[PDB]
Design a protein around this ligand. Structure first.
Ligand SMILES: CCCCCCCCCCCC(=O)SCCNC(=O)CCNC(=O)[C@H](O)C(C)(C)COP(=O)(O)O
Lengths: 76, 80, 109, 28, 83, 51, 247, 168, 48, 74, 70, 251
């Protein structure tokens, strides 16, 4: 309204219409995609698939932990 | 009706323990068809129809066994 | 005078009770056509007692009227959404006036 | 129009930690 | 958008013209329901309730009982920004 | 839209009317289709393996 | 208030862990139903008193009593989880209650009142304070992911393995502690402003935000990875539990 | 890829919550919808590989509470039940994000609404994917929180504040 | 609507006779004819 | 919202905290009756004794009712 | 018009001070005697015996005698 | 299986309700609606699909799981199974009633609404209509497509996710040993509920008068309207007890 224009907030307050919201939205897109890259690499490193799939699956492209926990009487 | 699928075949087929009954020998072809066909209902109608008939046959058999037992509960009452 | 104010005050009680009993009739009827028949019936009672001139027997009819309304009231009355008690009441209301925001508070100097 | 016309906030509402910005060309 | 006083004036008068004891004429934006038209007070609260449904307003019972002329029914709706 | 004495009604958008009728028609057909394929089965008239 | 609640309160529980429990193992076992009863009563009763307080600082002060009596249940459980959880809750309380006393002081330095009735609606004028206040409100409710949940659950684990009744009464603070923390937050932050009492407002400045930063980092750091603390404690905790027995 | 399923809605909520003053109503709407919808697509791929391909996924990030035998862990379990619930949660949430884009267009505080929507989604994912009772408890409480935040999203209304407290 | 109270409200409800606001039961089952028609065309198609 | 009411009368206790047409104990009696419907229905289920009219014999599974497959001694 | 300090209300402040000064009102009435007896004495003794009984029931589950407590 | 099916038509019903509410200027009372089928054809169509699927109309998404639960409950030859069958079956009559009661009051009865709302109506914009159409397709085909996958007899889809011990398996007996009448009770019960809803909301005109003159019938109306006075009893006896304790006793 009137006084809310003098109030700072992280989410922008009411009816937030930043003028350059498109370049900021696209810059925000890139940050998430750059954040996602280490996450995906760590995920692929950490996944454990003790069973071979019935058909080839997209996670056989980057994951190398298929059919590994066969020796279970050795896990510590 | 006699047991066909040995214990090893059921274990290798990873059949749920509740479906390791007399009709297990027909479930194995059915589940292999089901996985290969992404479990769509218009597929494997032939293996599904055969296995369902066996399971229908089993339940009727136990239903008839009780049909008998129920005819002897009254016999004891009619002679008591 | 005093009989004017006392009777006029009694007038207001009747008019409001008619207003409330008439709206609660629409709550129980829902449908418009059922509301026409039920509104006509409710009016006829207020007319049966409109001849009474014993100021005291009126205070007794009014009190009996409020008891009847409070007893047979609809448990879920209709409310305009923006009105008090409505579904939209106090949703995104306009800011109050007179609010000031202070900058540079609590500086070391 | 909300996707094809840019916004109107030339500068954000309020000030971060409620401190008035310094004079143009100056540092806090 | 807001509704012009003229738009209110047409509509509130249309509400009282429909009243059976009220013939189409002698209804100007100034007339009093119980005097010029010669109706009972119960007749007025039904008009107030039809004016309520016409603009979809919820008038508090106190303010509703004060409205006894078309001039009072006009000025209330015009003031109300939710009409 | 059309005005009838104060209260005006706007006609719905054409594709709203087309999709509504079409989706329910797709629904009615799918019901008739299914009822003829496995309707006797749920009635108990015949069994899936009958043949 | 920060020093009184965050450090001085810890001295009685520290004295129980350093002197009474290890030095007199036989007496500690005998008084365990007695400690369990007193702590359980304090948790239930003082939580309900907190519900009916109308002063901002009184609600936070009374909450501290219930948190500290849950600590005593943990240390007198005499196992790894109970004593380990009791130390973690002690540390967590010194951060959470300290941060909470800092939030109330932020409000008091500006408006000079502690009565909840005057406040309300503050989210529309001080959104930064409202967000920080909500986070420490959650940490005071022992929300999982916050530092206080780690100590709280570990104490309940250790109590359950000894007496299931005291662990049940102590778990009632999950319901009660939620009730007064959210009621406090909503009456101060939520709703509409009341310009007849307060009309001039300032959100946090640079010094107050910085003050809150290490409290947020510490609360998150313990809440998600308490291992850096538990690892450095378990050897001392283990020998405290074993003190006085040889089997 | 399995970590991107759980943590994409968190990323979407983080951007809208912390940086909604730079994106506005339109930017925050696109940001939270895209991340949730991407997680929805990966969830469809996960349903194909775990349920249709019969290959379960086990993922262990780090310990949470390790105290003697107590072993709560940041660990994820993806079996047939999990990927069914992943599909339900991610698909419905993606639609509700799209639906809210125009349903809350006239609301003054849409970016906070979209942020709360995505944080609920992240906690629900943490509930269905956990491999231990404590991670499930974290999801259990988190969705209790996000529901509270969304029931009284119109904080000025007293009935919403009464309802949100009663829910919690 | 016999009494003056009822006669008033029906008079004010006289807009509720709107063409496309009334007789809504003939819209109760949209797509009923088209679905049946398609089922008819399919049923003939299955004969050959 | 509009104008918050500032008190003008001495505030009483139990004000920090301060279901219309039906009384307190009358509501408890109506709810008690409603829960008494479930109680009587449950008793009727016992009186019915559906377990005694089972139309089939208990399933028997091969291999000693899958004793080994259920974790028993092999 | 002036300052950030709250505009004090005499009725709200009176409610505040009457809360802080409750100990001057205690009178030792019948109701208080029942309340203090039930929740100051009887209920803690009930909780104490419940906790002891919980320990004792464990002792006879382990084939052990009843452990002594102060 | 009922969970995923439920996630489709219930979400379609809430999102369709919102479109009516948004169209009718945030009106939510059904007593001020009616005559909206032709004004909002898209919304009504999605609501019909969702409702018919929720009530378990044959061969929709809700039919492939609701009916199997009611069949399995009959097959459970235990006291609690008999308890569930009776209560689950009667609720089908009750759910069909309010499902159709909603539809008739909202879109089919002669309009009970305000003019200013009717003259400001509009239907779903694209980002609101797209989820509704996708959920209609789900609330029509998901149930048939996913049955053999989920509850197909002897299916291995769940692998080791779910466990049913051999002694507790009843699916085969529930599908074969059941009398044909049992599988037809829900549709017979649903039809009765639709017809009863039509009569109470389109014909009966002195029915409400029972409550406006009879004390027992008036309390009964309020009993089911105020949710068995559950909130009340729990507020007057439980919340108030603890609130009063924290002041009068502990403090
Ligand atoms: C949910 C609803 C349940 C039922 C509630 C209905 C209440 C019961 C109905 C009857 C109420 C009474 O007896 S209330 C008693 C009504 N009668 C009187 O007050 C006596 C004389 N009053 C007058 O002077 C006027 O006729 C006056 C009537 C004021 C109008 O004035 P107008 O001539 O200028 O319209």
């Amino acid at each position: 309204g009137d006084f809310r224009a003098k109030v700072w907030s992280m989410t922008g307050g009411p009816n937030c219409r930043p003028k350059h919201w498109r370049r900021n939205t696209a810059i925000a897109m890139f940050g998430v995609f750059l954040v996602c890259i280490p996450i995906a690499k760590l995920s692929a490193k950490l996944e454990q698939r003790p069973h071979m799939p019935v058909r080839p699956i997209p996670s056989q492209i980057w994951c190398k932990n298929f059919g590994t926990k066969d020796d279970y009487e050795k896990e510590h | 009706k006699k047991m066909i699928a040995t214990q090893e075949e059921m274990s290798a087929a990873k059949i749920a323990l509740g479906s390791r009954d007399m009709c297990a020998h027909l479930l194995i072809p059915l589940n292999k068809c089901r996985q290969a066909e992404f479990y769509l209902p218009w597929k494997c109608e032939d293996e599904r129809h055969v296995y369902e008939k066996c399971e229908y046959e089993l339940v009727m058999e136990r239903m008839l066994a009780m049909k008998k037992i129920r005819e002897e509960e009254a016999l004891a009452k009619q002679n008591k | 005078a005093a009989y004017f104010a006392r009777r006029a005050a009694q007038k207001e009680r009747v008019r409001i009770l008619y207003r409330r009993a008439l709206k609660d009739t629409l709550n129980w009827a829902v449908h418009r056509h059922i509301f026409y028949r039920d509104a006509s019936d409710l009016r006829e009672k207020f007319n049966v007692n409109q001849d009474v001139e014993d100021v005291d027997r009126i205070d007794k009819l009014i009190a009996h009227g409020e008891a009847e309304y409070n007893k047979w009231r609809h448990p879920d009355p209709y409310i305009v959404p923006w009105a008090p008690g409505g579904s939209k009441f106090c949703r995104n209301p306009t800011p109050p006036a007179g609010i000031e925001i202070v900058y540079n508070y609590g500086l070391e100097d | 129009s909300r996707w094809a016309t840019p916004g109107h906030e030339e500068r954000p509402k309020g000030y971060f930690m409620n401190r008035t910005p310094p004079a143009p060309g100056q540092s806090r | 958008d807001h509704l012009s006083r003229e738009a209110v004036v047409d509509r509130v008068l249309d509400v009282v013209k429909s009243f059976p004891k009220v013939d189409p004429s002698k209804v100007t934006p100034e007339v009093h329901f119980q005097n010029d038209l010669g109706l009972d007070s119960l007749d007025t609260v039904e008009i107030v309730m039809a004016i309520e449904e016409e603009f979809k307003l919820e008038i508090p019972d106190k303010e509703a009982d004060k409205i006894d002329s078309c001039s009072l029914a006009i000025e209330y709706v015009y003031n109300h920004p939710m009409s | 839209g059309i005005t009838y004495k104060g209260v005006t009604v706007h006609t719905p958008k054409t594709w709203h009317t087309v999709t509504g009728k079409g989706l329910c028609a797709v629904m009615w057909f799918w019901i008739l289709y299914r009822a003829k394929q496995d309707g006797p089965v749920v009635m108990g008239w015949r069994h899936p393996w009958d043949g | 208030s920060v020093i009184l609640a965050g450090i001085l309160l810890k001295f009685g529980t520290y004295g129980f862990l350093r002197f009474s429990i290890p030095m007199f193992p036989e007496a500690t076992l005998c008084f365990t139903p007695f400690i369990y009863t007193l702590s359980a009563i304090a948790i239930i009763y003082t939580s309900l008193t907190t519900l009916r307080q109308i002063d901002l600082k009184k609600i936070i002060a009374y909450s501290s009593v219930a948190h500290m009596n849950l600590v005593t249940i943990g240390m007198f459980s005499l196992n790894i989880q109970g004593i380990g959880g009791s130390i973690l809750l002690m540390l967590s309380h010194g951060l959470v209650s300290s941060a909470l006393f800092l939030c109330v002081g932020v409000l008091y330095d500006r408006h000079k009142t502690r009565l909840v009735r005057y406040y309300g609606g503050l989210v529309s004028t001080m959104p930064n304070f409202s967000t920080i206040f909500f986070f420490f409100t959650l940490a005071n409710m022992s929300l999982p992911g916050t530092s206080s949940f780690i100590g709280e659950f570990l104490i309940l684990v250790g109590a359950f393995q000894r007496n299931s009744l005291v662990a049940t009464l102590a778990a009632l603070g999950m319901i009660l502690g939620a009730a007064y923390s959210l009621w406090l937050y909503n009456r101060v932050v939520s709703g509409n402003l009341k310009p007849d009492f307060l009309h001039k407002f300032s959100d946090l400045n640079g010094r107050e935000v910085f003050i809150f930063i290490p409290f947020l980092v510490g609360l998150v750091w313990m809440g998600v990875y308490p291992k850096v603390f538990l690892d450095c404690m378990h050897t001392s905790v283990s020998n405290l539990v074993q003190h006085g027995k040889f089997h | 890829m399995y970590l991107l399923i759980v943590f994409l809605p968190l990323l979407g909520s983080s951007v809208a919550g912390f940086f909604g003053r730079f994106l506005g109503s339109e930017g925050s709407a696109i940001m939270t919808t895209t991340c949730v919808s991407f997680s929805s697509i990966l969830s469809l791929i996960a349903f194909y590989e775990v349920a249709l391909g019969a290959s379960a996924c086990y993922l262990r990030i780090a310990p949470w509470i390790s105290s003697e035998m107590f072993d709560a862990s940041w660990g994820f379990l993806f079996d047939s039940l999990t990927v069914v619930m992943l599909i339900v949660v991610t698909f419905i949430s993606s639609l509700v994000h799209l639906y809210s884009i125009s349903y809350m267009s006239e609301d003054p505080h849409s970016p906070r609404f979209m942020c709360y929507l995505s944080i609920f989604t992240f906690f629900m994912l943490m509930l269905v994917t956990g491999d231990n009772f404590l991670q499930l408890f974290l999801g259990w409480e988190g969705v209790g929180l996000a529901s509270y935040l969304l029931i009284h999203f119109w904080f000025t209304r007293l009935q919403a504040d009464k309802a949100a407290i009663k829910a919690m | 609507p016999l009494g003056t109270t009822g006669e008033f409200f029906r008079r004010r409800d006289e807009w509720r006779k709107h063409p496309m606001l009334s007789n809504q039961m003939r819209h109760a089952l949209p797509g009923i004819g088209i679905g049946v028609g398609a089922f008819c065309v399919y049923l003939v198609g299955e004969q050959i | 919202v509009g104008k918050h009411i500032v008190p003008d009368k001495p505030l009483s206790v139990n004000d920090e905290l301060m279901a219309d047409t039906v009384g307190k104990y009358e509501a408890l009696a109506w709810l008690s009756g409603g829960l008494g419907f479930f109680v009587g229905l449950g008793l009727l289920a016992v009186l019915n004794d559906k377990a005694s009219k089972v139309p089939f014999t208990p399933r028997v599974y091969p291999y000693d009712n899958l004793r080994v497959e259920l974790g028993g001694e092999p | 018009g002036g300052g950030m300090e709250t505009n004090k209300n005499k009725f709200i402040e009176d409610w505040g001070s009457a809360r802080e000064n409750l100990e001057h009102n205690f009178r030792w009435t019948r109701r208080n005697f029942a309340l203090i007896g039930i929740f100051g004495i009887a209920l803690p003794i009930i909780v104490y015996k419940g906790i002891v009984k919980d320990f004792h029931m464990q002792d006879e589950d382990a084939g052990r005698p009843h452990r002594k407590f102060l | 299986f009922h969970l995923m099916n439920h996630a489709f038509f219930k979400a379609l019903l809430f999102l369709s309700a919102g479109s009516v509410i948004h169209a009718m200027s945030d009106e939510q009372d059904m007593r001020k609606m009616g005559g909206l089928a032709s004004s909002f054809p898209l919304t009504y169509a999605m609501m019909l699909i969702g409702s018919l699927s929720l009530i378990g109309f044959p061969f929709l998404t809700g039919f492939y799981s609701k009916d199997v639960i009611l069949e399995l409950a009959y097959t459970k030859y235990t006291i609690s199974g008999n308890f569930a069958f009776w209560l689950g079956s009667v609720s089908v009559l009750f759910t069909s009633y309010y499902s159709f009661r909603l539809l008739f009051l909202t879109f089919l009865v002669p309009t009970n609404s305000f003019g200013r709302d009717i003259s400001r109506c509009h239907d779903a914009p694209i980002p609101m209509a797209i989820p509704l159409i996708l959920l209609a397709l789900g609330s029509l085909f998901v149930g048939y497509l996913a049955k053999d996958m989920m509850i197909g007899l002897g299916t291995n889809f769940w692998a080791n996710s779910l466990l049913v011990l051999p002694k507790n398996e009843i699916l085969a007996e529930s599908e074969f040993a059941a009398p044909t009448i049992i599988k037809l009770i829900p549709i017979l019960f649903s039809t009765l509920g639709a017809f009863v809803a039509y009569n109470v909301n389109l014909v009966a005109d002195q029915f409400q008068r029972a409550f406006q003159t009879s004390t027992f019938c008036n309390r009964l109306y309020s009993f089911f309207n105020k949710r068995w006075f559950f909130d009340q009893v729990l507020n007057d006896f439980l919340v108030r007890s603890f609130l009063r304790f924290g002041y009068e006793v502990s403090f």
